[PDB]
Amino acid sequence: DNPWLDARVLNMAHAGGENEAPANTLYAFKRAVKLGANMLELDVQSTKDDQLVVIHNATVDQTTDGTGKVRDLTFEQVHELDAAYNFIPGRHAVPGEPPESYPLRGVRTGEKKPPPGYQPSDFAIPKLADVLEAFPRTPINIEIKGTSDADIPSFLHNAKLLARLLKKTGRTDFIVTSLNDLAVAKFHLLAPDIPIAPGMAGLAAYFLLGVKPMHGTVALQIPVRYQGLEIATPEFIRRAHADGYAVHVWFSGTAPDDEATYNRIIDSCADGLMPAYPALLERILDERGIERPGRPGVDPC
């Protein structure tokens, strides 16, 4: 069967909580786990020397002080930069504001003292290997990224790199996914034991034609709305459940990262949310007594 139909309700920190902390940094992950997130959610790219690093965009421009495409830079180049240079609470990463906007700019580079409990390295772009070292016992939702939407070779390069590494850990508490369905198929071929979730065309095909997503799928990981169509409804999740799949919902501009939304998606029987505000979600769950993995409680439907 599917263990993930019981792993609910999940607080899956979107890149660690991009509205509450520098996205894809160890600070964000360490913070997010500490306040009660059941699962990390993160993005992977690869350096010029084929090192899997945890970053979302193909270019380091938006979240750091540097410039260039991750695949053009070595890990040693990428690691020295400040992955909190442009963080602003409530607004992820936004360059060009008064330097006082940035409460954690410069901590990686040593110009400000880190908050208590963290080192300057907790604010750089981490190797995926270092995140796995740091969370041996936390499930990690990993998403394969590429150089551009149409650069199918870069997704496949990353899928290869990812499966090799995840195999070496011998772990199984992952969910690997990509917007590019080819990457998922290639990843599933190289690492059949690791749970996946469908890419874009598999989701369309399931929603539209009933076609079950690739063997090995544990969950459907869906935005709330897409191009006007409401995806994460009670009915859609009723059917996904009936067909044996979990539903994890993300937001990221398709619907507001706010309290009413999180509540509606909880009420829609989703099994996990991917909030940019993992603190805000954790408070809602605690306050409502919603069942959690292990810790039982209220079933909101």
Ligand X SMILES: CCCCCCCCCCCCCCCC(=O)OC[C@@H](O)COP(=O)(O)OCC[N+](C)(C)C
Binding residues for Ca(2+): 41, 43, 143
Q: Considering beta carbons, is residue 49 or 97 the nearer one to ligand X?
A: 97
Q: Answer yes or no: 157 catalytic.
A: no
Cα–Cα distance, 145 to 217 (Å, whole number)? 19
Q: Considering beta carbons, is residue 21 or 290 the nearer one to ligand X?
A: 21
Q: Are 106 and 112 in contact (CB under 8 A)?
A: yes
Provide, rounded to whole angstroms, the least separation between the CB of residue 111 and ligand X. Answer: 24
Cα–Cα distance, 14 to 32 (Å, whole number)? 9
Provide, rounded to whole angstroms, the least separation between the CB of residue 229 and ligand X. Answer: 6
Binding residues: 41, 43, 143
Cα–Cα distance, 1 to 250 (Å, whole number)? 24
Residue 18 sits at the vertex; the CA angle it makes with 274 and 31, to the nearest 5 degrees, is: 90
126 half-sphere exposure, CB direction, 13 A CA radius: 26
Q: Considering beta carbons, is residue 126 or 223 the nearer one to ligand X?
A: 223
Q: Considering beta carbons, is residue 188 or 299 the nearer one to ligand X?
A: 188
Provide, rounded to whole angstroms, the least separation between the CB of residue 132 and ligand X. Answer: 19
Instruction: Calculate the alpha carbon distances from 97 to 17, 103, 112, 206, 287 in Å.
Output: 21, 12, 18, 43, 36
Active-site residue, from 14, 92, 188, 248: 14
The DSSP bridge partners found for residue 225 are: 230
- Residues in touch with ligand X (CB under 6 A): 14-15, 18, 23, 56, 92, 143, 177, 179, 199-200, 203-204, 207-208, 221, 223, 226, 229, 231, 250, 252, 274
> Which of 155, 190, 194 is closest to 173 using CA atoms?
194
Provide, rounded to whole angstroms, the least separation between the CB of residue 31 and ligand X. Answer: 15
Ramachandran quadrant class, 10 (left: phi over 0; alpha: psi -120 to 50; beta: rest): beta
Q: Considering beta carbons, is residue 92 or 186 the nearer one to ligand X?
A: 92
The DSSP bridge partners found for residue 103 are: none
> Which of 181, 186, 235 is closest to 204 using CA atoms?
181
Cα–Cα distance, 214 to 17 (Å, whole number)? 29
In sequence order, what E strands does the chain have?
10-14, 39-46, 52-54, 140-144, 174-178, 219-223, 225-226, 229-230, 246-250, 272-274
Provide, rounded to whole angstroms, the least separation between the CB of residue 287 and ligand X. Answer: 25
Which residues belong to the active site? Answer: 14, 56
